[PDB]
A = this chain, B = another copy of it.
Amino acid sequence: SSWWSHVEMGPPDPILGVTEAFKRDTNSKKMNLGVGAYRDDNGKPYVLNCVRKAEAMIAAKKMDKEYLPIAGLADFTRASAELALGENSEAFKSGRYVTVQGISGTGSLRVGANFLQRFFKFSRDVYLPKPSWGNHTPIFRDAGLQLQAYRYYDPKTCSLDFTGAMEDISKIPEKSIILLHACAHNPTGVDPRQEQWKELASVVKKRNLLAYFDMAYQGFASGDINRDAWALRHFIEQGIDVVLSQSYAKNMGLYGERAGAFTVICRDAEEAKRVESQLKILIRPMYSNPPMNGARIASLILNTPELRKEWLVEVKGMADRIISMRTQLVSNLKKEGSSHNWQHITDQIGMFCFTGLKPEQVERLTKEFSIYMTKDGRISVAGVASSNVGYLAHAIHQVTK
């Protein structure tokens, strides 16, 4: 017997594990529609133009690789706050916030759950939608809080169960924590309507719950960043002090560089100066300081007028294309002769489609066509190219026929 003879084999990740499996397939026509990762119309990873140019200035500049403050690059930190909040914003104009650079959305989400475990003295309960992104569970559980659920999706009608959500939300105990997805709900692609949001805001404010916003797709829901931050701002402007996590993994295609941020909306500037210190105390014994590259890239872009403009034209370009892939898919399904209603494909927003396929179908998909998706029926439409939309339509159809 050794030290680790009792450590058993744990399973591959529900999501990430798909990329691993995909990797090993020898089928020349394999498609990885597992993770939410953008591909150009050639079905090739796409590094944004503004990104290529921002990296080049960094180089040109001959910058050091010295340790960053515990909290991250100030410029990035500040530029994020702003991207989330809006320049007009009183919250931002008053400095009543604390933004800390995190290890992308995941890392921010975690710093945040660990902050909460430590200082949220009113409850240990975090409420997640049904369904929610898989990683939300272990992130919160590992940080040490309890998990709960509120109704969200209605698979019978392929949309938001608003009456059920309102009922569940209306009964969450006061001062509990609720996780809401800012826009492009994962894995559903169905977000509450503006009017619906106004209503949720009321009940959240009414029940005095702490709103935890996960903002991983700003600019992917509508192709417009300010429109994507509506709901978030609407909440804060209603007097709800939220906490939020931002990812630059998809909107900037900085996936493996890992750039993100965790923000806390406080009552005052002084309150923020104290939350800040405790966040740093939290981060220090975790990874000490954050990865500089991704943050340097982001910041140069966010803070360089022409990089910001180009960035926005590119975020528009990526959303339009997913749209053109959605369109083409449904169209192909009818063309293959599909008797099914594929309306949700084009109804849904974001990088995926929550297709409704059963596990046997997902299974057949992988094995007969070398098409990889998650077991919940979620496909990354973001990863389809003009060249294989036909192939997918066909397979989806065969296994559905």
A295 vs B278: C-alpha distance in the bound complex, in angstroms? 30
- Decide yes or no whether A344 CB sits under 8 A from chain B: no
- Decide yes or no whether A13 CB sits under 8 A from chain B: yes
Partner of A285, one of B2, B142, B267: B142
Q: Which residues of B contact A70 (CB under 8 A)?
A: 13, 16
A4 touching B286 by the CB < 8 A rule?
Answer: no
- Decide yes or no whether A321 CB sits under 8 A from chain B: no
A275 touching B7 by the CB < 8 A rule?
Answer: yes
Among A61-69, A87-95, A192-200, A299-307, the one that faces the other chain is A61-69
Question: How many of these chains are in the complex?
Answer: 2
B-facing residues in A28-55 (Cβ within 8 Å): 35, 37, 45, 47, 51, 55
Partner of A110, one of B51, B119, B121, B285: B285
Residue of B nearest to A284 (CB): B13
Q: Taking A139-B285, A287-B106, A291-B291 as contacts, is the C-beta distance between A278 and B65 under 8 angstroms?
A: no
- Decide yes or no whether A163 CB sits under 8 A from chain B: no
A256 touching B68 by the CB < 8 A rule?
Answer: yes
- Decide yes or no whether A353 CB sits under 8 A from chain B: no
A271 touching B2 by the CB < 8 A rule?
Answer: yes
- Decide yes or no whether A146 CB sits under 8 A from chain B: no
Partner of A67, one of B66, B69, B255: B255
- Decide yes or no whether A205 CB sits under 8 A from chain B: no
B103 touching A287 by the CB < 8 A rule?
Answer: yes
A69 vs B13: C-alpha distance in the bound complex, in angstroms? 11
Binary interface profile of A, 1-43, with partner B (CB < 8 Å = 1, else 0)? 0111111111111001001100000000000000101000000
Of A273, A281, A289, most B-chain CB atoms within 10 Å: A289
Q: Which residues of B contact A210 (CB under 8 A)?
A: 3
A337 to B: closest C-beta gap in Å: 36
Binary interface profile of A, 287-314, with partner B (CB < 8 Å = 1, else 0)? 1111111100000000000000000000
B104 touching A287 by the CB < 8 A rule?
Answer: yes
B285 touching A10 by the CB < 8 A rule?
Answer: no
Q: Which residues of B contact A19 (CB under 8 A)?
A: 67, 69
A134 to B: closest C-beta gap in Å: 10
B-facing residues in A115-149 (Cβ within 8 Å): 119-121, 135, 138-139, 141-142
A6 vs B106: C-alpha distance in the bound complex, in angstroms? 27
Q: Which residues of B contact A284 (CB under 8 A)?
A: 13, 16, 135, 138
A256 touching B120 by the CB < 8 A rule?
Answer: no
B3 touching A291 by the CB < 8 A rule?
Answer: no
A249 vs B290: C-alpha distance in the bound complex, in angstroms? 12
B11 touching A291 by the CB < 8 A rule?
Answer: no
Partner of A291, one of B9, B55, B103, B288: B103
Q: Could you list 30 examples of A-B contacts with CB < 8 Å?
A: A2-B241, A2-B267, A3-B120, A3-B241, A3-B266, A5-B267, A5-B271, A6-B121, A7-B271, A8-B274, A9-B273, A10-B278, A10-B280, A13-B284, A16-B70, A16-B284, A16-B289, A19-B67, A20-B69, A35-B67, A37-B67, A47-B65, A66-B255, A106-B288, A110-B285, A138-B285, A141-B285, A258-B291, A287-B287, A293-B293
The 8 closest A-B pairs by CB, nearest first: A103-B287, A291-B291, A138-B285, A45-B64, A106-B288, A256-B292, A107-B287, A293-B293
